[PDB]
Amino acid sequence: MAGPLSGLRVVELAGIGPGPHAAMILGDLGADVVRIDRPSSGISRDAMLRNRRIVTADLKSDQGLELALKLIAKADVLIEGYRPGVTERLGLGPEECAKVNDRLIYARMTGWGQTGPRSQQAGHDINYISLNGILHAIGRGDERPVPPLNLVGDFGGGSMFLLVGILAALWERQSSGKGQVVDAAMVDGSSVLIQMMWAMRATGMWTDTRGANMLDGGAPYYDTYECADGRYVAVGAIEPQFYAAMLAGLGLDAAELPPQNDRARWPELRALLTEAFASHDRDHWGAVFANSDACVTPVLAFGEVHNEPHIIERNTFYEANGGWQPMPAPRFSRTASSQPRPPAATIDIEAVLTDWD
Amino acid sequence: MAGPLSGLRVVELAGIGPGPHAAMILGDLGADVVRIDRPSSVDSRDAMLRNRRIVTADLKSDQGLELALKLIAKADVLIEGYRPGVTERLGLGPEECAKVNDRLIYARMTGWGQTGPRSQQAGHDINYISLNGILHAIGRGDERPVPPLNLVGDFGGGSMFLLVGILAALWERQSSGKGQVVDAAMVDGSSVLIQMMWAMRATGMWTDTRGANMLDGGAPYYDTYECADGRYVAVGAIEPQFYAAMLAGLGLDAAELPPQNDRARWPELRALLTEAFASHDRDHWGAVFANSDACVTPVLAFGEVHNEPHIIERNTFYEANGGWQPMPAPRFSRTASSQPRPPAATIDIEAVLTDWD
Ligand SMILES: CCCCCCCCCC(=O)SCCNC(=O)CCNC(=O)[C@H](O)C(C)(C)COP(=O)(O)OP(=O)(O)OC[C@H]1O[C@@H](n2cnc3c(N)ncnc32)[C@H](O)[C@@H]1OP(=O)(O)O
Ligand SMILES: CCCCCCCCCC(=O)SCCNC(=O)CCNC(=O)[C@H](O)C(C)(C)COP(=O)(O)OP(=O)(O)OC[C@H]1O[C@@H](n2cnc3c(N)ncnc32)[C@H](O)[C@@H]1OP(=O)(O)O
């Protein structure tokens, strides 16, 4: 198994959203990932289950439980993404696991956390980010907030903090001999993910008004613009020098414009930039600003990404199954990840135990 | 120093965006983090620079270069986020560091990658997520894409993958006795962050049309709703049992609505939910649905977060310098993080070498 995490052993209790994602990235980086699902559920067609061995096991039977504790005893990391109390009642809780393996990294992935008034409340991404200020800050000012898919609570503020916790605990274990419990709550991870805004708010550089900020779409130089063909470019020319280069490429004389950061005149600046970008198509601007520091890029739909030179040449994607999927990230000079293995048809939990003795 | 990364030594070549966020988190979890800025910037209110020692050094000079190469010699990790070729030309490239410390994790944080046609273009978050299909997918169907702040490219798809690569490489160094180069590019990280959508596209369960999918605001049961007071709730009632609980709380009989997943009749369903949510204020809905699985939560503004019971009790935030800031994530049972230390005055680079033996 290729990658920096070769020989890491991971048991994943099947859930949804962050847990599977974290487990995927471990697999991607060459960890040995065994996913316990329930027998009620051919080859699974969710490519988020790549780089896994899938076993079934009724964890409510005494046999399925025992079989599971046998895996966990042979493993470095356990991931679970159920409401609190769930693993405990299965007899798979942190304390039961410590009995069969005091070295285990016990990784708990929730939205709301392990305790507290909301800890038994069902939820999805959109809910975890509603409570901590994040969702309110996203979208245009004249409109209701828009969910940034499930990228911020589940993955960015969720799976990724679970991973940072699993791997920091493994480092700590190198010196202590011992495992421990990682409590990764989406409401917490996503708040750290957005620490920059909390910092900026303290220094009066961010307001709670939606659509009135440097990075939320309010700044005319950090937003998308519609082009003559109805497609879009993104402009991100925060630095004055990059901003100047953008104006020149648009054909606009800086002298006739309001200042870049005179916020009172932003509506006026935006009207001028809107008219300029609308006068040619997306691909024209892509060509004009190639090799430039103007921070102007075409906004590609998923279906066009495979045709973009910079994407093709770094192999950010590989072809699979129905189509393209992202190659592992990040990349390693010496112990390079390899292409993911497709979702690996159900194997028998005994076989795995033989393999791991 | 409290936390799982106690004893980890980190050298950070001062930059912007992901690199400082990654460095912040390492420090958050107990790492000993030393930040080399240029003296050209000598004065900090940026609470992203918490858990840090700051030092000055003209790396263009001979003395600067040598003092930096000494710190790097005595450290586990180097973080840099300059364009490719910068550290090489400065004499702090991977090869030069390898000659003074072959245990070093050499962590390279860019947007576009170390090579390829865009590898030298300036950019920010909005640029990196524009090329890989992400930005096009965010926002309402009848409007241009809206940036999800800088959450998806800088942090979730940037710093967080940097952290995972650093920590994965540290694990690997337990076997090999050798460091390596981590190449974290925001266009790759963010692509893995959205792997779900790439999977779902392959199986026909996600389209390239903005605002017409399950998780982008197109589903009436996964979206925000405006209330009587002009504030908002979030609805995330994906599973039919949670949807049913929401309907009951709204006072709508299932028998009068279209089916939850009859997409052709989503216009009607949205109209019905819209009218219902509009009939009371946010805080009313917050009360009705506390302790429910209805997946309905108030959309709070930053400024209101500190009064939410569940946030207070879990101490998701701490006070510092006229404003709240997030506590470290995730959480650790045995080697818990401590409250971050604020930015300090600059320290002498000699005194750091002295302290580090
Ligand atoms: C691909 C297209 C589909 C769309 C994807 C969905 C959207 C993306 C996800 C997000 O946006 S994050 C959303 C999920 N939130 C979390 O994961 C936070 C923590 N988890 C939860 O809050 C709950 O797991 C959740 C609300 C998601 C679902 O609640 P359930 O009540 O279905 O499950 P719960 O976690 O409470 O318990 C699972 C049950 O399965 C049982 N179980 C688990 N594995 C088993 C096994 N192998 N055999 C037998 N039983 C098993 C477990 O024993 C337990 O039984 P109990 O009835 O005794 O409590
Ligand atoms: C701080 C204000 C508020 C923050 C708002 C912005 C936050 C949002 C951030 C985002 O959305 S991600 C944006 C950043 N993108 C990246 O970080 C990807 C990789 N970095 C880059 O693409 C470039 O660094 C960047 C476009 C951000 C800036 O380009 P520059 O052309 O200013 O720097 P470049 O990387 O080429 O080189 C850095 C320079 O500093 C010099 N340098 C650095 N540390 C030095 C030192 N200590 N002493 C002397 N010289 C030093 C280095 O020599 C070199 O100068 P020279 O070309 O003149 O040699």
Swiss-Prot record, chain A:
Changing D154A: 17.6 of wild-type activity. Development of gem-disubstituted substrate-product analogs as inhibitors of racemases and epimerases is elaborated using alpha-methylacyl-CoA racemase from Mycobacterium tuberculosis as a model enzyme. These non-physiologic substrates could be used as a therapeutic agent to inhibit human AMACR, which is overexpressed in prostate cancer. One of its GO terms (biological process) is lipid metabolic process. Changing D188A: 3.3% of wild-type activity. Keywords: Isomerase, Lipid metabolism. GO terms for molecular function: alpha-methylacyl-CoA racemase activity; protein homodimerization activity. The keyword Lipid metabolism applies. Inactivated by N,N-dialkylcarbamoyl-CoA substrate-product analogs. The active site is at H124 (proton acceptor), D154 (proton donor). It holds the Pfam family CoA_transf_3. It catalyses: a (2S)-2-methylacyl-CoA = a (2R)-2-methylacyl-CoA; (2S)-2-methyltetradecanoyl-CoA = (2R)-2-methyltetradecanoyl-CoA; (2R)-pristanoyl-CoA = (2S)-pristanoyl-CoA; (25S)-3-oxocholest-4-en-26-oyl-CoA = (25R)-3-oxocholest-4-en-26-oyl-CoA. Changing R50A: 15.7% of wild-type activity. Substrate binds at residues 38, 57-60, 81-83, 89, 123-128. The keyword S-adenosyl-L-methionine does not apply. Changing R89A: 19.9% of wild-type activity. Its EC number is 5.1.99.4. Signal peptide: none annotated. PANTHER family: ALPHA-METHYLACYL-COA RACEMASE, SUCCINYL-COA--D-CITRAMALATE COA-TRANSFERASE. Catalyzes the epimerization of (2R)- and (2S)-methylacyl-coenzyme A (CoA) thioesters. Accepts as substrates a wide range of alpha-methylacyl-CoAs, including (2R)-2-methylmyristoyl-CoA and (2S)-2-methylmyristoyl-CoA, (2R)-pristanoyl-CoA and (2S)-pristanoyl-CoA, and the cholesterol esters (25R)-3-oxo-cholest-4-en-26-oyl-CoA and (25S)-3-oxo-cholest-4-en-26-oyl-CoA. Can also catalyze the interconversion of the non-physiologic substrates (2R)-ibuprofenoyl-CoA and (2S)-ibuprofenoyl-CoA, which are potential competitive inhibitors of the enzyme. Belongs to the CoA-transferase III family. Homodimer. Interconversion is achieved via a planar enolate intermediate. This is Alpha-methylacyl-CoA racemase. The gene is mcr.
From Swiss-Prot, chain B:
Changing H310A: 10.1% of wild-type activity. Inactivated by N,N-dialkylcarbamoyl-CoA substrate-product analogs. Substrate binds at residues 38, 57-60, 81-83, 89, 123-128. Gene3D superfamilies: 3.30.60.110, Crotonobetainyl-coa:carnitine coa-transferase, domain 1, formyl-coa transferase, domain 3. Its EC number is 5.1.99.4. One of its GO terms (molecular function) is protein homodimerization activity. GO terms for biological process: acyl-CoA metabolic process; lipid metabolic process. It catalyses: a (2S)-2-methylacyl-CoA = a (2R)-2-methylacyl-CoA; (2S)-2-methyltetradecanoyl-CoA = (2R)-2-methyltetradecanoyl-CoA; (2R)-pristanoyl-CoA = (2S)-pristanoyl-CoA; (25S)-3-oxocholest-4-en-26-oyl-CoA = (25R)-3-oxocholest-4-en-26-oyl-CoA. Coiled coil: none annotated. Development of gem-disubstituted substrate-product analogs as inhibitors of racemases and epimerases is elaborated using alpha-methylacyl-CoA racemase from Mycobacterium tuberculosis as a model enzyme. These non-physiologic substrates could be used as a therapeutic agent to inhibit human AMACR, which is overexpressed in prostate cancer. Keywords: Isomerase, Lipid metabolism. The keyword DNA-binding does not apply. InterPro entries: CoA-transferase_III, CoA-Trfase_fam_III, CoA-Trfase_III_dom3_sf, CoA-Trfase_III_dom_1_sf. The active site is at H124 (proton acceptor), D154 (proton donor). Belongs to the CoA-transferase III family. Homodimer. Interconversion is achieved via a planar enolate intermediate. Catalyzes the epimerization of (2R)- and (2S)-methylacyl-coenzyme A (CoA) thioesters. Accepts as substrates a wide range of alpha-methylacyl-CoAs, including (2R)-2-methylmyristoyl-CoA and (2S)-2-methylmyristoyl-CoA, (2R)-pristanoyl-CoA and (2S)-pristanoyl-CoA, and the cholesterol esters (25R)-3-oxo-cholest-4-en-26-oyl-CoA and (25S)-3-oxo-cholest-4-en-26-oyl-CoA. Can also catalyze the interconversion of the non-physiologic substrates (2R)-ibuprofenoyl-CoA and (2S)-ibuprofenoyl-CoA, which are potential competitive inhibitors of the enzyme. This is Alpha-methylacyl-CoA racemase. The gene is mcr.
